[PDB]
């Protein structure tokens, strides 16, 4: 039974990015790697991440007006933001710390590079572990499983 | 989306192979994928995931990997309520709603907010919405008590063994998706995963429609555990697959049938021609290398032309219109591959739009209907060739109007364009048989079209020691304004020139172009 190659043991926290902008995040422990990952995602997709986290808070209509209002009504009516706070508290201690670290990484990216964050989404910062849980909740249960279109009797999302 | 896992016995070198190949919109923000590599002293994960997710759904490492496709697990019910006397009828008697006065703020054009009230009503079923047409619908979503979705994925993708993988999967915290697994020890697995309500009656279509909201008869309360769901591990055929087909040919020969499961879990509809190709490409090939595995992934066959052109062409050559006759000869001489240089493909698509509907999934035009007894060779034939020739007449006109001619090269109309990169297209619509998918948009005024959806993250992994993996991301790793990493992979995609995915520290150090020291002080 051949064993795999020796696992790398990181001695410092660093992102080594390659020439296509792929981050290789090395952490001395789990929370450090999650923080690095949050930082990297904020660098690569920061604006749209903040916008989505804003929506999953129930705050789309408040932050960005009418175009975001029907999603706000869907998510508030289905209790998504409060349920996310519940699920966040119901995490295991260890995994909650990874989620907090991911959110801290986002916040730290934005704090050290405020020029990279679009004006319209700055009001979303700071983000929390619960925000991360909430977007995942909206995505799985209230986009994939239960879509507004199926319940409300509308149409299917952007292609054509 | 496509997904393949191949067992060691079906390969030349003896190492399992995995294909990750999700198809989603190239524009929808929450569907945008991101590639990354996380390494700590205790775990390593490489792969892609939707932005804003802190765990990698399409992951692999030196020991194992997974991939996902949409299965449509019916995890919610929409109930039609019968309103009466300010309440709703339920088990003979009027029952009042739970009602809660909430509110939210709405941004105004001048940058201020106004406070807007929002009543939230629930029946026993769940929250109540009113459709425009006046129907009161209560929605009941399963699995609202499953807080561990992210951690389940995290434990699945860092599993020390298949047994640990399965134990995590078995928590039922991930509410949907087909999930395919493979590892360096040689195990492959397919699971039709999700949180599915236990119900005592009704097939899937009944539970996808509006279910009566006036009786506890239809009020489910429990959900199925993992071992009630279609699954396949290390099957005799040496592979598993799913290309969004119902879970009834996840391998070949099969290991179960629809009768073996409750009829509300998955449909028993005809498998797409892409799904049929998925099965053929794995089953008909033996002694697979990673190189051959990758070549097979690029398959772009107009399978529906295989099923229809034998009947359509001679019928069309009978027609007195010289243009229809010429359309028939052009189609007859085509090798039935969606290549850049194909002069017939665009015209064939337009014919198929009419023959099989705008989504190409229509069955009524075929002479021989689909059957699970011949799941990769039906449906077949043209039922009414005279009608189909009329469809070709119309399609000729449509083709000329959209593209300027009946024989414009496929890759001249079909382009992949990101920022200032503009490269020739190939492959196409899944429902026509193309395994590699590019769901081409409608053309602009000049007949140019681009992918709205299709290949996004694509990776193929051999679980040798060390592992060997290749991949591309159609739309790059960044979408932030000004990034050099949005349009920098699409030219490679146009040539199927895959990047070696770099997991070993020495490879990473050789490829490094930027270093971000960080530290996290809780």
Protein described:
The complex is a heterodimer of chains A (160) and B (522). Chain A contains 7 helices and 2 strands. Chain A is mainly α. In chain A, strands 1-2 form a two-stranded antiparallel ribbon. The relative contact order of chain A is 0.14. Chain B has 522 residues and is an alpha+beta fold. Chain B folds into 3 domains: 1-75 and 142-267 and 451-508, Aminohydrolase, N-terminal nucleophile (Ntn) domain (Glutamine Phosphoribosylpyrophosphate, subunit 1, domain 1); 76-141, Penicillin G acylase, beta-roll domain (Roll); 270-450, Penicillin amidase (Acylase) alpha subunit, N-terminal domain (Orthogonal Bundle). In chain B, the strands form 9 sheets. In chain B, strands 20-1-2-27-28-29 form a 6-stranded antiparallel beta sheet. In chain B, strands 7-16-17-19 form a 4-stranded antiparallel beta sheet, with no helix packed on it. In chain B, strands 14-15-8-18 form a 4-stranded mixed beta sheet. Chain B is globular. The chains are: A mainly alpha (160), B alpha+beta (522). Strand 2 (23-26) of chain A pairs parallel with strand 4 (33-39) of chain B.
């Amino acid at each position: 039974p051949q064993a795999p190659i020796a696992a790398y043991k990181p001695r410092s926290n660093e992102i080594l990015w390659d020439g296509y902008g792929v981050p290789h995040i090395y952490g001395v422990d789990a929370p450090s790697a999650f923080y690095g990952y949050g930082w990297a995602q904020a660098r690569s997709h920061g604006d749209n991440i903040l916008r989505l986290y804003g929506e999953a808070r129930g705050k789309g209509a408040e932050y960005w007006g009418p175009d975001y209002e029907q999603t706000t009504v869907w998510l508030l009516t289905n209790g998504v933001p409060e349920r996310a706070q519940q699920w966040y508290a119901q995490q295991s201690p260890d995994f909650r710390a990874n989620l907090d670290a991911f959110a801290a990484g986002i916040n730290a990216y934005a704090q050290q590079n405020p020029d990279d964050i679009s004006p319209d989404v700055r009001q979303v910062l700071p983000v929390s572990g619960a925000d991360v849980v909430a977007h995942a909740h909206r995505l799985m249960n209230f986009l994939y499983v239960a879509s507004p279109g199926r319940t409300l009797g509308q149409g299917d999302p952007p292609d054509l | 989306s496509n997904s393949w896992a191949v067992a060691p016995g079906k390969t030349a070198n003896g190492n399992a192979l995995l294909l990750q190949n999700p198809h989603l919109s190239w524009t929808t923000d929450y569907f945008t994928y991101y590639e990354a590599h996380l390494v700590t002293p205790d775990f390593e994960i490489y792969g892609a995931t939707q932005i804003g997710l802190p765990v990698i759904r399409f992951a692999f490492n030196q020991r194992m990997g997974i991939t996902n496709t949409v299965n449509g697990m019916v995890g919610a019910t929409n109930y039609r309520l019968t309103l009466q006397d300010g309440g709703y009828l339920y088990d003979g008697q009027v029952r009042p709603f739970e009602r809660r006065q909430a509110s939210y703020r709405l941004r105004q054009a001048d940058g201020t907010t106004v406070d807007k009230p929002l009543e939230i009503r629930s029946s026993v079923h769940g929250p109540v919405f009113e459709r425009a047409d006046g129907t009161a619908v209560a929605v009941r979503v399963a699995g609202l008590d499953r807080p561990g979705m992210l951690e389940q994925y995290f434990d699945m993708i860092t599993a020390d063994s298949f047994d640990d993988y399965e134990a995590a999967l078995a928590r039922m915290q991930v509410p949907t998706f087909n999930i395919v697994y493979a590892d360096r020890e040689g195990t492959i697995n397919y699971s039709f995963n999700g949180v599915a309500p236990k119900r005592a009656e009704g097939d899937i279509a009944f539970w996808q429609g509006l279910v009566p909201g006036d009786s506890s008869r239809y009020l489910w309360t429990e959900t199925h555990p993992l071992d009630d769901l279609p699954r396949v591990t290390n099957p005799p055929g040496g592979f598993v697959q799913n290309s969004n087909d119902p879970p009834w040919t996840p391998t070949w020969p099969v290991t179960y049938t629809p009768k073996d499961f409750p009829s509300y879990l998955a449909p028993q509809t005809p498998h797409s021609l892409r799904a049929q190709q998925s099965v053929r490409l794995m089953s008909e090939n033996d002694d697979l290398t990673l190189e051959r595995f990758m070549a097979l992934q690029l398959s772009h066959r107009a399978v529906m032309a295989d099923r229809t052109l034998p009947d359509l062409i001679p019928a069309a050559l009978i027609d007195p219109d010289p243009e229809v006759q010429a359309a028939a000869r052009l189609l007859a001489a085509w090798d039935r591959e969606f290549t850049s240089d194909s002069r017939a493909a665009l015209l064939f698509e337009e014919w198929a739009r009419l023959f099989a509907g705008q989504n190409f999934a229509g069955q009524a035009g075929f002479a021989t209907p689909w059957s699970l007894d011949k799941p990769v060779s039906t449906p077949y034939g043209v039922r009414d060739p005279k009608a189909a020739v009329d469809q070709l007449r119309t399609a000729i006109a449509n083709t000329k109007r959209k593209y300027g001619a009946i024989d414009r090269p496929f890759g001249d109309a079909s382009r992949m364009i990101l920022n200032d990169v503009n490269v020739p297209g190939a492959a196409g619509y899944g429902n026509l048989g193309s395994f590699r998918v590019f769901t081409w948009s409608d053309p602009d005024e000049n007949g140019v079209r681009t992918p709205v959806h299709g290949e996004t993250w694509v990776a193929m992994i051999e679980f040798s020691t060390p592992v060997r993996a290749y991949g591309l991301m159609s739309y790059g790793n960044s979408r932030q304004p000004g990034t050099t990493h949005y349009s920098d992979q699409i030219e490679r995609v146009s040539r199927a020139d895959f990047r070696e995915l770099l997991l070993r520290r020495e490879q990473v150090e050789a490829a490094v172009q930027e270093r971000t020291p960080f530290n996290f002080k809780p």
